[PDB]
Amino acid sequence: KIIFRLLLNVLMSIIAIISYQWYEQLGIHLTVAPFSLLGIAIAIFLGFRNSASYSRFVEARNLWGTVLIAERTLVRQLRNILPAEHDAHRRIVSYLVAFSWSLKHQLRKTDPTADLRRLLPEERVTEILASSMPTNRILLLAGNEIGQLREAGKLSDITYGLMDNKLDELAHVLGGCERLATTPVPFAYTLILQRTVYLFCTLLPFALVGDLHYMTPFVSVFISYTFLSWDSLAEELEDPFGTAANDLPLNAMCNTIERNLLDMTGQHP
Amino acid sequence: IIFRLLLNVLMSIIAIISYQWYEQLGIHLTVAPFSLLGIAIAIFLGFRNSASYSRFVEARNLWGTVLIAERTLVRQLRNILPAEHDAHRRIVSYLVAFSWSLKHQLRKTDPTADLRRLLPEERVTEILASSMPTNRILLLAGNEIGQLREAGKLSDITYGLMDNKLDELAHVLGGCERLATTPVPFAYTLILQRTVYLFCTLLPFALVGDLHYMTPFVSVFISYTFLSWDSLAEELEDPFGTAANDLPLNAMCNTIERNLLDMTGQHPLP
Amino acid sequence: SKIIFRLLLNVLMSIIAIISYQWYEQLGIHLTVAPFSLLGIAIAIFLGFRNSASYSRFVEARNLWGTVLIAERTLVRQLRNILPAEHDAHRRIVSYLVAFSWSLKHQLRKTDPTADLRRLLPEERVTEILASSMPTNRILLLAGNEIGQLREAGKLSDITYGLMDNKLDELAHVLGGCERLATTPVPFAYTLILQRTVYLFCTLLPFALVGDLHYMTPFVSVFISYTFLSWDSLAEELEDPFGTAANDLPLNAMCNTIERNLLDMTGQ
Amino acid sequence: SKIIFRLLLNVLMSIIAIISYQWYEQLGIHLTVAPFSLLGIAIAIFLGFRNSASYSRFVEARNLWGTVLIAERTLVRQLRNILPAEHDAHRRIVSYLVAFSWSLKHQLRKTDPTADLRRLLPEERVTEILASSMPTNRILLLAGNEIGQLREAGKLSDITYGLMDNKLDELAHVLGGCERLATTPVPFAYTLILQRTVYLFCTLLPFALVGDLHYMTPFVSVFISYTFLSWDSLAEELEDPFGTAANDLPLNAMCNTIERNLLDMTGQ
Amino acid sequence: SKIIFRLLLNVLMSIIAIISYQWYEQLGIHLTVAPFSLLGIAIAIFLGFRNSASYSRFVEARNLWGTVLIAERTLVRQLRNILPAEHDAHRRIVSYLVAFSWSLKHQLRKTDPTADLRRLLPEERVTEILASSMPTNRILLLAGNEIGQLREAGKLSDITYGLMDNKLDELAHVLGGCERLATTPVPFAYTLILQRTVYLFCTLLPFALVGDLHYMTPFVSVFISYTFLSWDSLAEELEDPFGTAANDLPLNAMCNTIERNLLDMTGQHP
Ligand SMILES: [Zn+2]
Ligand SMILES: [Zn+2]
Ligand SMILES: [Zn+2]
Ligand SMILES: [Zn+2]
Ligand SMILES: [Zn+2]
Ligand SMILES: [Zn+2]
Ligand SMILES: [Zn+2]
Ligand SMILES: [Zn+2]
Ligand SMILES: [Zn+2]
Ligand SMILES: [Zn+2]
Ligand SMILES: [Zn+2]
Ligand SMILES: [Zn+2]
Ligand SMILES: [Zn+2]
Ligand SMILES: [Zn+2]
Ligand SMILES: [Zn+2]
């Protein structure tokens, strides 16, 4: 809907053109210089803001990359260290796959019930849904699988530890994503910028008309487009787990993770 | 902040009525020098705000680590010692006490009620007697893990896995303390703030020659932009400070407590 | 560089601006420099921040590849220090580590890894690796099998097994990092906004300059265009670090360095 | 603040500009604001990036010192948790850890650590530490020996020995980091460039403003100068973090805090 | 710094602008300040980012070298703490660690490491190291063999071997980090764009300023030129942190410091 404010800006320019006649007869003067000062200041602030928004997006993408890496290596360790424990391989993989989908639902604020039931027995589904953090309970359940292998003497404390480390890595991902989801960049940044950029763009033609006359709408819309484009891009990057164009394709990412883990456990889709 | 905008409107009205006597004295104010001054100030505000934002982000990262480390420690205790519930409860109590005590320390509020709610009075007295109560809580959590080791319930290896988590917490405590004693700039920030203020108040006098009656509208818009950006950096620089929003810190301490009670079967109701 | 075309086009736009400046008043068009200074400075600021992001992405790609060389060197060092007599195991693992590098290279370039793999590995494993949808990952799994067997045979203890397992983790992070950089680009809306904005700005500029500069319009306009276009195109080249373009990573040379290193450390 | 001298000098330059503005035309000399806006903006940008480097360096220094407290707190926690009955060992190790902090402070301040060391350690150990060309590093060695003896006596296993040795490693990173910051400044050519341009800019400024401002020249010229100088001086204050001045790190108080923490945790 | 030539050259361009400003109309040349303010500000922004990127490479390079000192100190400390009586092993390992630093320096400076190697190690080892296409890597391998042999002889357990092995890994990361900075420069089109652009801008500048500044043209033009040229050449110097220029790393002094540390008092420890 950025196109709406561009069209609206064209209308404000036309108002600026038709009312420029009555400018002197009202006592209003508007030069370009003060608006260059204001405009450059806003651009500087948009530049820094946009940079921060991009960094949050990059970090979110990084965290999701770590899910894939840590889950691959955990399965790799299980196969290298306990090549014959295939039942354990399957149970742990189902938890690792459930973890990814559940993380996705947590970040999207959606119901993980259907995905959980496709992957896990109903008793486990109930236990997981009852927790205030189902992704955390899933890590705990995956941990019990490894813990029981340890108690049975199949894993030593050392080899248990190598795998426990991967669960710590997933916990770090969970916390990182939760931090990015609960933290926006402070609201007062968009509040300043969104209101400020819009007000600036609509007032601009009134300041340009004295110099540009009929050429006001073209130059005004070009300037507005530049500022609005840069501003709206930051808003989209600030919410990496959202549904908007340039947000993370979390569903495709979860599919990739699941396909990887079924590839390493001899299963076919 | 709304007050200085009103003050800026007041300065504009003064600028408008007094612009008359300007020539008969020889005083001039053009836009170009204030354009120079304004852009330089905007540049400095950008860099300043960048540093402030960096401090805000680190504060959230440190707090994110409390939640991560405490979750995994409790996970390890269940996976490695599933039957040691007395130990689970005592350790959970210390970890929860650690979070609340850390919050109170950074906010300079009294941690007594949270401590008495969570721990036996003997320990509360010991903790309150220390000049570093949050560190003492980590020490007490360490004793719990250490006792399990002497009892032969943890090996040196599995002890080590849990000890690492207490280390993550010590790093959080030190990092927050460093962030609290901060700021880095030696209150040269006060200068920078005043500079923005003087600029906003002198501005209508520099614009009035060009803008005339339209001066207060344009002058207040520009002031609003600079003052807002300045106050945002001020808020970001002091994430644990005197005039800060307590909702996330409170939400985090509540979140970790709810998680750990969930992980130890203390929730739901039987 | 096809920038020379857009500069020549800019020279043409300037001459048009010069000859048509006559009809400016008779059309009602006024163009001053001040609004374009505002727009130009805004574009420069956004280009600066964008170029910064492109550079960092290029730098990360570079770092990831540096890690391949480091991790593979130390894994081989550990094998020699810990199991100096196990040369059969050395040779097998080295072939897997070298194959990992080439396979990663081919994957990022979207080229066929077959000859490099057949040169390094027996055909039996090659078919197995190529049968997977994630061949580079399958190679790490196979390298892991070698180390796991040394452990089961009692040649490695759990501790020394762990020391080497850590290096395989370091390689897994590299694989994930590179894949992330390959699938996730700097968002395409950075390019669209900036390319449209920079090009339109450069072509409209002489029409705004002509009133002040007159005949001097094309020289000053092309200089400004060149400055913006050069900086913009630099970001384009940095944004695709795994590509074939001259200012891209010398991945072929890097893989050769890695292979020469690992055969140097094994008397090969 | 000796910034006031440069402001007073700036007031004088403004007065000269006002009274000498008459002979401006009779010489053919003009100074407009526009070129000084360009120059001023460029200088502001470079001052920004520079202060950014000065700031990061000061922050790192504070970070390094923060780590001393964390690592020493945890080492003592480990000693209590793992060896609750070994109080003699607790005291000896604590005295080395406290000595390490004071010795680091003296090294960075280039002061004599002898009195602090004698307060903490037996004279034999003091002699041994001071005989070294790197006394703070030698203190880490001695702390490692205490831990090493516990390992040899069987009170620490290799695992628990390793847990504590890791903390000595963190301290080694602090020592090297501080030494690196002490010898490596923000490069001097940044300060030299900036110092030369900022001073010249502020003194030339009133001559460039007088044509526009007339009688208001000293007030606006001083405002602008104060703004650049305040920002420039901020770097000056951040650049010497290990010094004694009021805006430098309170290393003495920091060392006292470290010592009080460690004696709180050992019942002293 | 060859900036002094281009500054003097810029003064000449100003005098040309002053003497030819009358003839501007008779040639059809008009040049205002506004377009050059736009162009100059864009260049300053780009120079700012470029210099920031150059400084970061410098900082990383200094950090990698700091790690050599740290990792080598702790490796020697560990050897003294864990195997206090193995002085023959201490000496051999220290000589490899010292050779590693000097060999790294020569590799980055593209100089011959032969003399330094012969000074520190027996000739048999020198030939083995010189025979490798990567001598610094071969030195780490030899330092690793020493540790590996202590392990095989039962003097180190797998655990204590691992503690020392970690430090050799830390050194491998330094070697790789330095090679990455050395084999890859910032892209060569950074140097090309900016140098041509800054120079062309500075020489064209007086022709645009003279209409405003008249006789003051050479002074203001050279001032602006000095600011842009200095910032540009400093960035060029920092991008090559292993080079010989004055703002580059004192690698020789750093290697001497490392050598003096590890050989502090005839290698004698308590
Ligand atoms: Zn990992
Ligand atoms: Zn299986
Ligand atoms: Zn952790
Ligand atoms: Zn329990
Ligand atoms: Zn609950
Ligand atoms: Zn490594
Ligand atoms: Zn071999
Ligand atoms: Zn064989
Ligand atoms: Zn093929
Ligand atoms: Zn630590
Ligand atoms: Zn004690
Ligand atoms: Zn000082
Ligand atoms: Zn280290
Ligand atoms: Zn010795
Ligand atoms: Zn003249």
Side-chain angles (χ1 to χ4, degrees), chain A residues 2-3 5-23 27-182 184-186 188 190-269, chain B residues 1-181 183-185 187-270, chain C residues 1 3-4 6-24 28-268, chain D residues 1 3-24 28-268, chain E residues 1 3-270:
Chain A
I2 181 176
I3 186 176
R5 294 192 294 268
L6 289 183
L7 290 172
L8 181 49
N9 194 252
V10 173
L11 189 150
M12 297 305 295
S13 291
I14 301 175
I15 294 182
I17 291 183
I18 67 175
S19 66
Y20 180 66
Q21 301 178 295
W22 313 105
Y23 260 43
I28 64 183
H29 293 59
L30 290 171
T31 56
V32 174
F35 279 78
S36 283
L37 166 56
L38 181 55
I40 292 171
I42 294 171
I44 291 171
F45 300 150
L46 280 170
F48 278 102
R49 198 277 296 260
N50 191 303
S51 185
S53 307
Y54 178 76
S55 288
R56 285 170 51 84
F57 182 84
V58 164
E59 193 191 357
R61 183 66 188 83
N62 243 263
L63 290 167
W64 272 95
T66 301
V67 175
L68 181 58
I69 298 158
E71 292 191 347
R72 274 167 170 170
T73 78
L74 181 47
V75 176
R76 182 190 54 73
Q77 289 170 331
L78 280 161
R79 284 198 73 168
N80 297 154
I81 300 171
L82 299 170
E85 300 291 330
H86 193 55
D87 282 339
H89 299 161
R90 284 168 60 87
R91 289 195 300 274
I92 293 164
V93 161
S94 61
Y95 285 128
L96 297 179
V97 173
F99 172 87
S100 306
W101 288 107
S102 297
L103 183 55
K104 194 273 303 216
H105 286 291
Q106 170 182 341
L107 299 175
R108 289 275 172 81
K109 306 179 198 296
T110 51
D111 184 9
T113 304
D115 280 322
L116 292 177
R117 282 177 172 158
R118 173 176 67 88
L119 298 164
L120 302 170
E122 193 67 21
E123 297 84 351
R124 294 296 149 263
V125 170
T126 298
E127 176 178 346
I128 291 164
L129 291 179
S131 169
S132 66
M133 189 145 280
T135 46
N136 192 53
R137 172 64 50 149
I138 294 170
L139 280 184
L140 178 64
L141 290 171
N144 281 152
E145 291 291 329
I146 304 293
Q148 289 178 338
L149 291 168
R150 186 199 148 259
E151 294 181 358
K154 297 179 180 176
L155 289 174
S156 68
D157 290 345
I158 298 300
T159 55
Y160 169 87
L162 294 176
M163 301 185 189
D164 190 82
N165 295 336
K166 299 319 157 188
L167 296 183
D168 188 347
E169 201 163 359
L170 295 181
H172 279 266
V173 170
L174 172 56
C177 292
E178 168 185 28
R179 159 176 51 77
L180 289 180
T182 62
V185 172
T190 295
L191 177 64
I192 290 167
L193 279 182
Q194 195 176 347
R195 281 189 209 167
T196 301
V197 174
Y198 296 167
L199 186 54
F200 172 79
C201 290
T202 61
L203 255 45
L204 186 67
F206 293 120
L208 292 179
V209 68
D211 286 3
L212 302 185
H213 291 169
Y214 282 145
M215 283 293 304
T216 298
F218 299 111
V219 176
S220 182
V221 78
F222 190 4
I223 296 181
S224 289
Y225 174 76
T226 303
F227 282 74
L228 294 181
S229 292
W230 199 255
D231 178 55
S232 69
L233 175 59
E235 298 170 1
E236 281 191 13
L237 292 176
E238 272 166 2
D239 187 26
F241 303 136
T243 50
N246 182 16
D247 288 333
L248 296 179
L250 296 186
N251 276 0
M253 292 177 184
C254 286
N255 277 316
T256 293
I257 287 156
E258 178 165 5
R259 284 164 191 169
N260 266 264
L261 301 191
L262 291 173
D263 173 274
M264 295 176 66
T265 52
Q267 297 181 32
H268 295 292
Chain B
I1 182 176
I2 188 176
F3 176 78
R4 286 193 177 278
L5 291 185
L6 289 173
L7 181 50
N8 194 252
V9 173
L10 188 150
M11 298 306 294
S12 291
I13 301 175
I14 292 182
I16 292 183
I17 66 175
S18 66
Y19 177 67
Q20 302 178 22
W21 314 105
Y22 264 44
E23 275 301 331
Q24 290 155 343
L25 296 172
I27 64 182
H28 307 323
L29 288 171
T30 53
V31 177
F34 278 78
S35 174
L36 165 56
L37 182 55
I39 293 171
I41 292 171
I43 292 171
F44 299 155
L45 280 171
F47 280 103
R48 199 276 293 259
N49 195 304
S50 185
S52 307
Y53 178 76
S54 171
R55 288 169 51 83
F56 182 76
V57 162
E58 195 192 357
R60 290 184 60 80
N61 263 253
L62 291 166
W63 272 94
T65 299
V66 172
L67 186 58
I68 295 158
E70 293 195 350
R71 280 164 179 167
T72 82
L73 180 48
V74 174
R75 182 191 52 72
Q76 289 172 332
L77 279 162
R78 280 196 73 167
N79 298 155
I80 299 171
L81 299 171
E84 302 291 330
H85 302 294
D86 286 340
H88 297 161
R89 290 182 183 282
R90 289 195 300 273
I91 294 165
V92 160
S93 296
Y94 284 126
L95 297 179
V96 174
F98 173 87
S99 306
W100 288 108
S101 178
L102 181 56
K103 168 180 181 284
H104 286 291
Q105 173 183 344
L106 298 174
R107 290 274 169 78
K108 304 180 196 296
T109 49
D110 184 7
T112 301
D114 280 319
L115 292 177
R116 284 177 174 158
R117 173 176 69 90
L118 296 163
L119 302 171
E121 193 67 21
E122 300 85 351
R123 293 301 177 187
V124 170
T125 296
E126 172 178 343
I127 293 164
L128 292 180
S130 170
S131 290
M132 312 85 192
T134 308
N135 190 55
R136 172 63 52 151
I137 293 171
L138 275 185
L139 178 63
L140 291 173
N143 283 153
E144 293 294 329
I145 305 293
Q147 288 179 338
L148 292 167
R149 188 198 151 260
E150 292 182 357
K153 298 177 181 174
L154 291 176
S155 67
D156 290 346
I157 299 302
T158 59
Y159 170 85
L161 294 176
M162 300 185 188
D163 191 82
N164 297 336
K165 299 310 139 74
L166 297 182
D167 295 350
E168 287 186 350
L169 295 180
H171 278 267
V172 170
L173 172 57
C176 291
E177 275 170 359
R178 162 175 53 79
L179 252 17
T181 65
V184 276
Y188 252 58
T189 181
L190 180 65
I191 288 170
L192 280 180
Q193 192 178 346
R194 282 187 208 167
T195 297
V196 173
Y197 294 165
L198 187 54
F199 170 78
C200 290
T201 61
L202 255 45
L203 185 66
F205 293 97
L207 293 180
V208 68
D210 285 4
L211 302 184
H212 302 284
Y213 283 145
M214 285 294 305
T215 300
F217 300 110
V218 178
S219 183
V220 78
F221 191 5
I222 298 179
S223 289
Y224 175 77
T225 302
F226 281 74
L227 294 181
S228 293
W229 199 256
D230 179 57
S231 69
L232 174 59
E234 176 178 6
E235 281 191 14
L236 295 177
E237 269 166 0
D238 193 23
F240 305 135
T242 53
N245 182 210
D246 178 277
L247 181 147
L249 239 55
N250 217 70
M252 292 178 187
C253 288
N254 277 312
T255 293
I256 189 47
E257 176 165 6
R258 286 159 193 167
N259 294 343
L260 303 193
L261 287 171
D262 283 6
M263 293 180 67
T264 51
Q266 299 182 240
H267 286 186
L269 233 231
Chain C
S1 295
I3 182 175
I4 186 176
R6 296 193 186 281
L7 290 185
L8 289 172
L9 191 149
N10 193 253
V11 174
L12 293 174
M13 297 306 295
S14 291
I15 68 180
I16 294 181
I18 291 183
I19 67 174
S20 66
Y21 179 68
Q22 301 177 294
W23 316 106
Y24 262 44
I29 63 183
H30 293 58
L31 290 172
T32 55
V33 177
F36 278 77
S37 284
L38 165 55
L39 182 54
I41 293 170
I43 293 171
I45 292 172
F46 301 159
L47 280 171
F49 279 103
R50 198 278 298 261
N51 194 315
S52 185
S54 307
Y55 176 78
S56 289
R57 175 179 159 95
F58 185 86
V59 163
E60 193 193 357
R62 291 186 45 69
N63 264 254
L64 291 166
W65 273 94
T67 301
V68 175
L69 180 58
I70 295 159
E72 293 193 349
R73 274 166 170 170
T74 78
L75 180 48
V76 174
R77 183 190 54 73
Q78 288 170 331
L79 279 161
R80 281 196 73 168
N81 297 155
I82 299 172
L83 300 171
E86 300 291 331
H87 302 295
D88 286 341
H90 299 162
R91 290 173 65 88
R92 289 195 299 273
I93 296 164
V94 161
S95 60
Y96 281 132
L97 297 180
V98 175
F100 173 89
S101 306
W102 288 107
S103 179
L104 182 56
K105 193 269 296 196
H106 284 290
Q107 174 184 346
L108 300 173
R109 289 274 174 81
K110 303 180 196 296
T111 51
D112 185 11
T114 302
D116 282 321
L117 291 177
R118 287 177 176 158
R119 172 175 66 88
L120 298 164
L121 301 170
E123 192 66 22
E124 297 84 350
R125 290 299 178 187
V126 172
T127 57
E128 173 177 343
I129 292 165
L130 293 180
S132 169
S133 291
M134 312 86 192
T136 309
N137 189 54
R138 176 63 51 152
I139 292 171
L140 275 186
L141 178 63
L142 292 173
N145 281 152
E146 293 294 328
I147 305 293
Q149 288 179 338
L150 291 168
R151 188 197 151 259
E152 295 181 359
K155 298 178 180 175
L156 291 176
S157 68
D158 289 346
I159 299 302
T160 57
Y161 170 87
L163 293 175
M164 300 185 188
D165 192 81
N166 296 337
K167 302 320 157 187
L168 297 184
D169 293 349
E170 204 163 0
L171 296 183
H173 280 268
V174 171
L175 173 57
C178 291
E179 276 172 0
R180 162 177 52 77
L181 288 179
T183 66
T184 309
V186 172
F188 186 47
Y190 271 113
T191 297
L192 181 66
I193 291 168
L194 279 183
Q195 282 188 336
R196 281 188 207 166
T197 300
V198 170
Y199 293 167
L200 187 54
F201 173 79
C202 290
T203 62
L204 255 45
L205 186 67
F207 293 96
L209 293 180
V210 70
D212 285 3
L213 301 185
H214 302 284
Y215 282 145
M216 284 293 303
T217 299
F219 299 112
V220 179
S221 182
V222 78
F223 191 5
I224 297 180
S225 289
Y226 178 76
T227 301
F228 282 75
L229 294 181
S230 292
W231 196 254
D232 179 56
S233 69
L234 176 59
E236 173 180 6
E237 284 189 14
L238 292 176
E239 270 166 2
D240 189 26
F242 302 137
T244 52
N247 188 349
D248 289 335
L249 293 179
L251 296 185
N252 276 1
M254 292 178 185
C255 287
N256 277 317
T257 294
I258 288 155
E259 177 165 5
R260 292 156 48 211
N261 267 265
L262 303 193
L263 290 173
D264 175 274
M265 296 177 67
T266 50
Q268 295 179 290
Chain D
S1 295
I3 183 176
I4 187 176
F5 179 79
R6 298 192 295 268
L7 290 184
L8 289 172
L9 191 149
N10 194 251
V11 173
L12 188 150
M13 298 305 293
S14 291
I15 301 175
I16 294 182
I18 292 183
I19 63 175
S20 66
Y21 178 67
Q22 301 178 294
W23 314 105
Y24 263 43
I29 61 183
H30 290 59
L31 290 172
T32 56
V33 176
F36 278 78
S37 283
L38 165 56
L39 182 55
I41 291 171
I43 292 172
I45 293 171
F46 302 155
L47 280 170
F49 280 106
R50 196 278 302 263
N51 278 23
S52 187
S54 307
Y55 176 76
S56 289
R57 170 181 155 94
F58 187 92
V59 164
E60 194 192 357
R62 184 67 189 85
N63 260 255
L64 292 165
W65 272 94
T67 301
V68 174
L69 182 58
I70 296 158
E72 293 193 349
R73 273 167 169 170
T74 76
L75 181 47
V76 175
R77 181 190 52 73
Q78 288 170 331
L79 279 162
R80 281 196 71 167
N81 298 157
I82 301 171
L83 299 170
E86 300 291 330
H87 302 294
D88 285 340
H90 298 164
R91 286 195 293 270
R92 291 194 300 274
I93 293 164
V94 162
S95 60
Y96 284 125
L97 296 178
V98 173
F100 173 88
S101 306
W102 288 106
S103 178
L104 182 56
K105 185 273 300 214
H106 286 292
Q107 172 184 344
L108 301 174
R109 290 272 173 81
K110 302 180 196 295
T111 50
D112 183 8
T114 303
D116 283 324
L117 292 178
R118 284 177 173 159
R119 172 175 67 89
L120 298 164
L121 303 169
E123 190 66 20
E124 298 85 351
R125 305 289 85 164
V126 170
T127 296
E128 172 172 338
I129 293 165
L130 294 181
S132 168
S133 291
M134 308 84 194
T136 309
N137 190 53
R138 169 112 325 180
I139 292 171
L140 278 186
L141 178 64
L142 291 175
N145 281 154
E146 295 295 329
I147 303 293
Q149 288 179 337
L150 291 167
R151 194 192 65 92
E152 295 179 358
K155 296 179 179 176
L156 290 175
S157 68
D158 289 347
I159 302 302
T160 60
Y161 170 85
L163 294 175
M164 301 184 188
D165 190 81
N166 296 337
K167 299 310 141 73
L168 296 183
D169 294 349
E170 290 187 352
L171 296 182
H173 279 268
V174 170
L175 175 57
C178 291
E179 275 170 359
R180 160 177 51 78
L181 289 181
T183 59
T184 314
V186 176
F188 183 49
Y190 275 118
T191 295
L192 180 65
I193 291 168
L194 278 182
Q195 189 179 345
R196 283 186 208 167
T197 65
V198 172
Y199 292 167
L200 187 54
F201 174 79
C202 290
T203 63
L204 255 45
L205 187 67
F207 292 85
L209 293 180
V210 68
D212 286 5
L213 303 185
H214 288 168
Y215 282 144
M216 280 292 304
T217 299
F219 300 110
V220 176
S221 182
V222 158
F223 192 7
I224 298 180
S225 289
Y226 176 75
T227 302
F228 281 76
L229 293 180
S230 291
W231 192 256
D232 179 56
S233 69
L234 175 58
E236 301 168 1
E237 283 190 13
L238 293 175
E239 271 164 2
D240 189 28
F242 302 137
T244 50
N247 298 332
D248 293 335
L249 293 179
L251 297 186
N252 277 358
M254 292 175 183
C255 286
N256 279 317
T257 296
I258 283 156
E259 177 164 5
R260 289 182 63 256
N261 266 263
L262 303 193
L263 290 173
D264 174 274
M265 295 176 67
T266 52
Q268 297 182 254
Chain E
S1 295
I3 303 299
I4 186 176
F5 174 78
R6 294 191 292 268
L7 290 184
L8 289 173
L9 181 49
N10 193 252
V11 173
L12 292 174
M13 299 306 294
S14 290
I15 304 175
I16 295 181
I18 288 183
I19 64 175
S20 66
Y21 179 66
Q22 300 180 208
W23 315 104
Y24 264 42
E25 278 300 330
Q26 192 174 358
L27 295 171
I29 62 183
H30 296 59
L31 290 172
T32 55
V33 175
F36 279 78
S37 283
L38 165 55
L39 183 53
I41 291 170
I43 294 171
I45 293 171
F46 300 154
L47 279 170
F49 279 104
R50 210 288 257 255
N51 193 303
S52 185
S54 306
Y55 179 73
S56 289
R57 286 171 52 84
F58 180 90
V59 161
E60 194 191 357
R62 183 66 189 82
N63 261 256
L64 290 165
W65 275 93
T67 299
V68 176
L69 181 59
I70 295 159
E72 292 191 348
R73 273 169 170 170
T74 78
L75 179 48
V76 171
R77 182 192 53 72
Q78 288 170 331
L79 282 163
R80 285 166 168 173
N81 296 154
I82 300 171
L83 299 170
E86 298 290 331
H87 304 296
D88 287 341
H90 298 162
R91 290 195 297 272
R92 289 194 299 273
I93 296 164
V94 159
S95 60
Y96 284 127
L97 296 180
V98 174
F100 173 88
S101 306
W102 288 107
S103 180
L104 181 55
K105 189 267 296 193
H106 285 291
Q107 173 184 345
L108 299 175
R109 289 275 173 81
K110 304 179 196 295
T111 52
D112 186 9
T114 303
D116 280 320
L117 292 177
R118 285 176 175 158
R119 175 175 69 90
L120 298 164
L121 304 170
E123 191 67 21
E124 298 85 351
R125 292 296 168 263
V126 171
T127 56
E128 175 177 344
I129 292 165
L130 291 179
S132 169
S133 67
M134 187 63 68
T136 310
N137 189 52
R138 171 64 53 151
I139 293 172
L140 276 185
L141 179 63
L142 289 172
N145 281 152
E146 292 293 329
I147 306 293
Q149 289 179 338
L150 292 168
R151 187 198 149 260
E152 295 180 359
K155 298 177 181 175
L156 292 175
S157 67
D158 289 345
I159 300 301
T160 58
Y161 169 86
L163 294 174
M164 300 185 188
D165 191 82
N166 296 336
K167 299 309 138 72
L168 295 183
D169 295 349
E170 202 163 359
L171 295 181
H173 280 268
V174 171
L175 174 56
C178 292
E179 276 170 1
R180 160 175 51 78
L181 290 179
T183 65
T184 307
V186 282
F188 187 48
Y190 264 115
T191 57
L192 181 67
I193 292 167
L194 278 183
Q195 283 187 337
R196 286 189 212 167
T197 300
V198 173
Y199 296 166
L200 186 54
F201 172 79
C202 290
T203 60
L204 256 45
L205 186 66
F207 293 98
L209 294 181
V210 69
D212 286 5
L213 303 184
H214 302 282
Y215 282 146
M216 283 293 304
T217 297
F219 301 109
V220 177
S221 182
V222 76
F223 190 3
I224 296 180
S225 289
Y226 175 76
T227 301
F228 282 73
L229 296 182
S230 292
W231 206 255
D232 177 56
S233 70
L234 176 58
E236 175 178 6
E237 282 191 14
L238 292 177
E239 269 167 1
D240 187 26
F242 303 137
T244 51
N247 294 329
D248 286 331
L249 295 179
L251 296 185
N252 277 359
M254 293 177 185
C255 287
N256 277 315
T257 294
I258 283 157
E259 177 166 5
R260 289 180 63 257
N261 266 264
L262 304 191
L263 293 172
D264 167 27
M265 63 151 72
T266 56
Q268 248 151 71
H269 50 106

